[PDB]
Write a protein that binds this ligand. Structure first.
Ligand code: TA1
Ligand code: TA1
Ligand code: GTP
Ligand code: GTP
Ligand code: GDP
Ligand code: GDP
Ligand code: MG
Ligand code: MG
Lengths: 432, 429, 429, 432
């Protein structure tokens, strides 16, 4: 009755969503043919017969990865009027994603979302999966977030955005696309979550002992974070949480709405023994800087607010013991004006294991959603990458030639610099 | 005669009542079907206070359940003793509070209260001579703060003679569930001080001590924590449902505990509490009950009574006992702790004796204290409120729902005036 | 003695009666063959009012069925309880009304009424002492408006002393089935105000609320909607077919409810109505029946009684009960709702008590209200009529059947004179 | 007992009627040999033996397509005194259809209709199937509609006319034939329905995913509209409708009697899953402009009256919910003087599927008959096509030479222009 549709934009959105909807079927016993041999009513609309379909809209400008879902194993699961393709890709270009190509099929996708919005009565919010580096995931997403705030407005629009890595970048124009897509979504988004690739390569090597990871293995660990946040809508819990409750507890000021995700425990199959993994044991792994999924030192910043999502066999008393020790440590420090910096959620269901995966079966897990000022050092490095390339006016003729005024870069850069000094306003303490 | 209408609000207030109505049912022998299968004839003697007799000799509870989403309401009606409630009383919404006081009291609370008050009035007409109302909610949540205090503002406009008391849940010192709970508590205390005859402050943090230090439970859940709150609630109205040597009720306790109309915040306590196997190493007499009602580790509010001074003390006893052995202990705790009380109130201990113990036990007691030691509870909140309001953080979720900054200043002015009163009568003599 | 001749017109009036005669048959134990297989001896005590005894101890209904096409008549005679009607009474035509008042009242109605009145007179001679007639039809349709009001104009010319009442179906505010129903209702109300002793206004839209809000039926059909209308109709003449402590009939209700000869439009209500499984959570007493007869969600006409004022109220009770507990509730609803009534009529509540409940139930009641809150029903139609007549749209289907535009102006003048009367006595005192 | 004969004129009438009477046999279990191993009494006259024949008159001026019914599968079904042929076709010429060829065999067809009219007692009306572009379907139909209003008059004469497409025209003289046949049928017809070819090519491509449709596949979807209108005469329903009731509820003024048809749902076989298709879901597909079967924007006009024909498992309560939401939308807007713009009909029988067809088996369907002022923009484009060709007097010598005064074009054009300003009279609102 509390439904929540999800939107997957670009190639990065679909390949994450392949592992996500694979995981949702196993957490309810859903066959790949839509059958099963209403807790799941939030993410599945039942047909007249015994068949359930996802509430997802897969959109991409290039026809490669969408046809793989149309031809792969999960073929009879999706509604074929939802798998929206395009003629040509945006090709790492915000201007082709926002002016040239995106203005052709934006009215088709909004028609598909509005038909899903009508049959749902308790529609909470939207879940947009994209990446800052890609042409579609930054261009078409910035067009899409404009229309939803115009039409709906009062719905909790969330983003599990892929933040660009500090040292491992594939596309050369990633400093251009991240500045342009942030200036557009800043007035439309509610709470956008950051997940970096390079830190997950660090976790899968050090913890899982996998020296050869692929994008499949990255999409498994990301889908665990997607599962634990939406776990409260799908199962009964001793202390639940709603998607409306994230944007209230994690966003202090209307500009700063960029938290980061952290999942624990992440251990291998043979390392599932030799340790007990209590709730006081796995909570300290979250605030360890080695397990944070954004390559930033948290001791260079201050934590504003932190969400904790427990699931499995979790005792509510020992959570109170575990949080109390973290407030007594000295490396972890909060901001002066915020005395209460915790949002606690407990669910009963343990996280399941996908067969043919790499994580071991545990009885408890923690998803941490922390909003800290330590990301402000990373935004300044992104502005330093942007100011070098734009000073020589490199790659600009691929942007002006696709319907864009050249003076628009001064709009986005100065707004980012004004966003940069806002963390400096937060970073100072109170008076007396 | 003297019936009670029970109102539940928020996520916590519903899960207390789902435990609470299971507790009352064993004091009257009520199956989950809803019939009577007791053995003693005193159970149906005053059954009408918490139940309404239906056709076919079934009894339904006089309960009203309020939420803003169908999530927890679906959990209660599908759990045990969910088939006892009338399905008409389940009032709910579709938006959800989002853990916010503004959308709980202004936006969605105004569009729900008329659906609630048509059900409250329906229970109000059916009672013969209505005693008063009781409410179970939170103060850190969004629903139980906003929707809860809105119902109190509508009831007192209609029923000024009826008693109105809340078994509210107060936030904890060390840990914090809601991030914006200094805003949610402060805007709710401003409503509770003008519309409630008495208020039971309960901390979850004080309940985690008793489940570990006293009962030695390694793994307590909320089904075990909310079990103790419901045991306190039944011990308040236990002298209204059964005859005794000296009877009390909700109105007698509303007079003997409230000297000034703003000072009506309490601290509850229950006795006896032992371990499972460690009960055979201790006798169960009246001085064993008295020595457990007055130490600091038994209060259900995270406050040390040794700092302030008591104003009034209500002791409600259950089971067969003797009045001298009560007064041997009720006087002695007023002689040795002679500085810890207040001076200008002579004999500030109220005695209430019921005849019937709980199911299985031999005797029991219930502590309803009223002290100046709860000023630390408000000074801790009012320090956290001013530390967050001066930077105006988390404020656009309140300004975006039609709320001026004068409204925050009135609640902060009202709380500091309450702190100054408990500060006054502590050092007074 | 005091027999009733039942006339059915239009598509809706036939499908109500096919449900209606099944309802009456279970109050007398009548198989679909037509014999008697009841158990209580009071069923055949007054069987002659709705039935005629045939040779071989079979009973046939005193019903007359009118249509303009053999479509729905073939459905009734082939369905259940279609083999109970006399095949001579099925009067029908071949043209069909085409959903039009002109061809229902001028062209084909004039060539059918002589075939009908030779059957009405045949039932009129067979009755010992005839009480009066009743009619079931529509107001938005073509047949039940045109052919229906034409039969009333022929009956009142022959039988001025007999009572003539219609269980008409009035169009809805929000949705609309007939496009030209502001023309069909206005030309029919002009006939009903001069020839009917009393009229029961029934909206389909008010029936969709009770099937969803009260009975919680996810999928109601017309077999479930028309079931409630037939339950109201049996509750009117239930005090004529059974003895009671205080008996009433169609003539007593035609006097106590009509203060002025133009103000004879009603609103019906029935009680009790619960869900299927949600009946065990509620007692069934007299104040449970009274509190359901007076709220706005129980009226079968889409009008809020809180706007206007009642003139007279008929309460018809069934089953064994007590007269004081009736008057405990019938007086109390006249004290607390003291402004909602009219002032210059003292004790405007009529009491009728029958002894026999319906089959299975314990007791029941029937509400026949008469208020100034039905002026909103006519003001909504008269606004829609003038918004369509001023452009003269859909008018050549009326001018092409011999109808001048003065005829529309007379009906619109007659309706506004009726609105001014209910507007007068609302604000009068 | 409520019989209703049908008339099929020209090649467009027969090829539609081939799919229509194929569909009527499957909705009653009638063999192609007339046998079956009285609800169907309206459309079939029983012989002395166990054999039923259609109440249809197939007339055409060219002997090609009539002999295909005489030699095809449905051969032993029809009465061979009904399959009326001609020597030569009218050859896209109103004058040959109304003066030269049609005056030779018009007395033969009226003899065949009057013999069918005598054995039927509850004869409701006539159903004429033709096309505006053809020589026979516009010439011979205009002659035929004259005689029936003289003879019968009080019978509901309906037309499922094929409106000429805005951009896809085969015959060059289609602007001539449509103006001439409209001026003649305007004083004789009752309620003529419009169906365009080009919109059905748009529906079969977008919905059914058939990129190669033929005239057979167009005749299947048209026959579903013919079936749902005549469904109330053939089956019992909870809220029936008569053919006399259409001309009352849909025609406000005696000139404007041109509604348009819309059928829903139209989906493929594999798209029959993945969705539930409620009555509130398929009703919004009717008022969608993409599914309207006339290439006209409905938001450029205003709806006067609308008929809704439900069939199958249809709940009467949820129809009231579905109509109430449409009156709350803002793109759909009615005319000011009409507060009640709906005619609702419910039948019990679900629409069946022809074997070897393309539509899937559903449990419910909606036929919408809407009369809007949005067609007035299309008539003005037809007058613009007419005034260009007639100003050069092109193709006129093929009309004057076949017994016609040349000044007759000024009669039809000025009457159409007077019909054009009538919608402008309807389009303005009321006063105060
Ligand atoms: C042989 C015997 O007497 O066993 C007791 C028992 O020994 C003890 C350990 C009980 C027991 O309580 C617990 O173990 C406990 C654990 C976690 C949280 C709360 C309670 C008992 O459950 C409590 C229970 O008490 C009752 O039944 C009371 O009537 C109680 N009702 C319930 O607890 C209850 C609730 C739901 C379903 C069934 C029973 C009550 C108390 C106050 C007001 C009204 C009712 C019983 C018989 C016992 C056990 C089983 C061990 C104690 O509690 C109560 C409430 O009496 C714990 O401190 C006391 C000391 C008792 O001696
Ligand atoms: C154990 C018992 O009493 O069961 C009832 C029952 O519980 C309820 C749910 C019944 C039931 O009615 C419905 O469920 C219903 C649904 C849609 C539309 C109309 C009715 C019942 O059908 C109604 C039916 O009532 C009767 O038989 C009355 O005599 C009634 N006659 C019929 O409904 C009837 C009609 C055709 C064929 C057979 C019976 C009647 C009412 C007024 C005046 C004369 C007769 C019975 C026994 C029941 C059920 C089966 C559940 C209720 O209705 C009536 C008319 O009594 C719904 O509101 C009441 C509340 C009742 O408690
Ligand atoms: N987390 C994650 N990121 C991925 C994955 N595949 C690609 N990416 C990231 O996506 C970015 C590349 O952009 P794409 O999303 O593929 O491009 P697009 O937005 O779909 O559209 P075009 O650029 O026009 O092709 C880089 O930052 C990649 O690291 C994946 O499986 N997981
Ligand atoms: N809907 C539909 N239209 C058709 C079909 N076949 C032809 N038409 C249309 O009919 C028109 C041509 O008219 P015809 O019926 O062939 O001509 P006619 O009226 O028989 O007269 P002649 O040309 O003299 O034989 C064009 O607009 C065609 O698009 C068909 O199967 N379905
Ligand atoms: N004792 C107790 N406290 C609870 C329980 N559930 C929630 N709480 C407390 O209630 C507060 C959260 O309020 P909540 O009811 O969930 O929010 P709301 O429903 O939006 O008003 C926090 O202080 C929690 O610690 C419970 O079952 N028992
Ligand atoms: N309650 C109810 N209303 C009906 C039923 N059938 C038709 N109606 C209503 O009757 C009106 C149409 O009248 P109808 O009898 O069909 O036309 P007529 O037979 O030509 O007079 C509309 O207001 C319909 O809603 C039915 O079975 N029950
Ligand atoms: Mg891409
Ligand atoms: Mg041809």
């Amino acid at each position: 009755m509390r439904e929540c549709i999800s939107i997957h934009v670009g190639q990065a959105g679909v390949q994450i969503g392949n592992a996500c909807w694979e995981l949702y079927c196993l957490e309810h016993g859903i066959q790949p043919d839509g059958q099963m041999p209403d807790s799941f009513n939030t993410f599945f609309s039942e047909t007249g017969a015994g068949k359930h379909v996802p509430r997802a809209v897969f959109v991409d400008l290039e026809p490669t990865v969408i046809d793989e879902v149309r031809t792969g194993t999960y073929r009879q699961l999706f509604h074929p009027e939802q798998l929206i393709t395009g003629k040509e890709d945006a090709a790492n270009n915000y201007a082709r994603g926002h002016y040239t190509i995106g203005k052709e099929i934006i009215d088709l996708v909004l028609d598909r979302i509005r038909k899903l919005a009508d049959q749902c009565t308790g529609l909470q919010g939207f879940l947009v999966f994209h990446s800052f580096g890609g042409g579609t995931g930054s261009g078409f997403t910035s067009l899409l977030m404009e229309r939803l705030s115009v039409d709906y407005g009062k719905k909790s629009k969330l983003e599990f955005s892929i933040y660009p890595a500090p040292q491992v970048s594939t596309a050369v124009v990633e400093p251009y696309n991240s500045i342009l897509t942030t200036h557009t979504t800043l007035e439309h988004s509610d709470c956008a979550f950051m997940v970096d690739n390079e830190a997950i390569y660090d976790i899968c090597r050090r913890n899982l002992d996998i020296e050869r990871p692929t994008y499949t293995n990255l999409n498994r660990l990301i889908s665990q974070i997607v599962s634990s946040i939406t776990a409260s809508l799908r199962f009964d819990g001793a202390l639940n949480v709603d998607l409306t409750e994230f944007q209230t507890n994690l966003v202090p000021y209307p500009r700063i709405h960029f938290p980061l995700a952290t999942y624990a425990p992440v251990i291998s199959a043979e390392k599932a023994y030799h340790e007990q993994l209590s709730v006081a044991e796995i909570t300290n792994a979250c605030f360890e800087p080695a397990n944070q999924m954004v390559k930033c030192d948290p001791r260079h910043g201050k934590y504003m607010a932190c969400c904790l999502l427990y699931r499995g066999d979790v005792v509510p008393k020992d959570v109170n013991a575990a949080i109390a020790t973290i407030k007594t440590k000295r490396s972890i420090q909060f901001v002066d004006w915020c005395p209460t910096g915790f949002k606690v959620g407990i669910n009963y269901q343990p996280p399941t294991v996908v067969p043919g995966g790499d994580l071991a079966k545990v009885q408890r897990a923690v998803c941490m959603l922390s909003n800290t000022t330590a990301i402000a050092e990373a935004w300044a490095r992104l502005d330093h990458k942007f100011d070098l390339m734009y000073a020589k006016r490199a790659f600009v003729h691929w942007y002006v030639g696709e319907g864009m005024e050249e003076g628009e870069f001064s709009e986005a850069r100065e707004d980012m610099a004004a966003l940069e000094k806002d963390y400096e306003e937060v970073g100072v303490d109170s008076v007396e | 005669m003297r019936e009670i209408v029970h109102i539940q609000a928020g996520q916590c207030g519903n899960q207390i009542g789902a435990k609470f109505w299971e507790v009352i049912s064993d004091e009257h022998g009520i199956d989950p079907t809803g019939s009577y299968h007791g053995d003693s004839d005193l159970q149906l003697e005053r059954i009408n206070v918490y139940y309404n007799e239906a056709a076919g000799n079934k009894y339904v509870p006089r309960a009203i359940l309020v939420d803003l989403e169908p999530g927890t309401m679906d959990s209660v009606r599908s759990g045990p003793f969910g088939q006892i409630f009338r399905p008409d009383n389940f009032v709910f919404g579709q938006s959800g509070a989002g853990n916010n006081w503004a959308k709980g009291h202004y936006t969605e609370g105004a569009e729900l209260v008329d659906s609630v008050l048509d059900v409250v009035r329906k229970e109000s007409e059916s009672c013969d001579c209505l005693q008063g109302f009781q409410l179970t909610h939170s103060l850190g949540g969004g629903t139980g703060s906003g929707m809860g205090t809105l119902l109190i503002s509508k009831i007192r406009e209609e029923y000024p003679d009826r008693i109105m008391n809340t078994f509210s849940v107060v936030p904890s010192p060390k840990v914090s569930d809601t991030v914006v709970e200094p805003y949610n508590a402060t805007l709710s205390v401003h409503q509770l001080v003008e519309n409630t005859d008495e208020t039971y402050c309960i901390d979850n943090e004080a309940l985690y001590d008793i489940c570990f230090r006293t009962l030695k439970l390694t793994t307590p859940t909320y089904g075990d924590l909310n079990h103790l709150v419901s045991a306190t609630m039944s011990g308040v109205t236990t002298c209204l449902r059964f005859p005794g040597q000296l009877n009390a009720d909700l109105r007698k306790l509303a007079v003997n505990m409230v000297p000034f109309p703003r000072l009506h915040f309490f601290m509850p306590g229950f006795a006896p509490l032992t371990s499972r196997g460690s009960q055979q190493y201790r006798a169960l007499t009246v001085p064993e009950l008295t020595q457990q009602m007055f130490d600091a580790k038994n209060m259900m509010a995270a406050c040390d009574p040794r700092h302030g001074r008591y104003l009034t003390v209500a002791a409600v006893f259950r089971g067969r006992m003797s009045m001298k052995e009560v007064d041997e202990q009720m006087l002695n705790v007023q002689n040795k702790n002679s500085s810890y009380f207040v001076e200008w109130i002579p004999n500030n201990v109220k005695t209430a004796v019921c005849d019937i113990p709980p199911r299985g036990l031999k005797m029991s007691a219930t502590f309803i204290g009223n002290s100046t030691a709860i000023q630390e509870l408000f000074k801790r909140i009012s320090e956290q409120f001013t530390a967050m309001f001066r930077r105006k953080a988390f404020l656009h979720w309140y300004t975006g729902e039609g709320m001026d900054e004068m409204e925050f200043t009135e609640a902060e002015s009202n709380m500091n005036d309450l702190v100054s009163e408990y500060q006054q009568y502590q050092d007074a003599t």
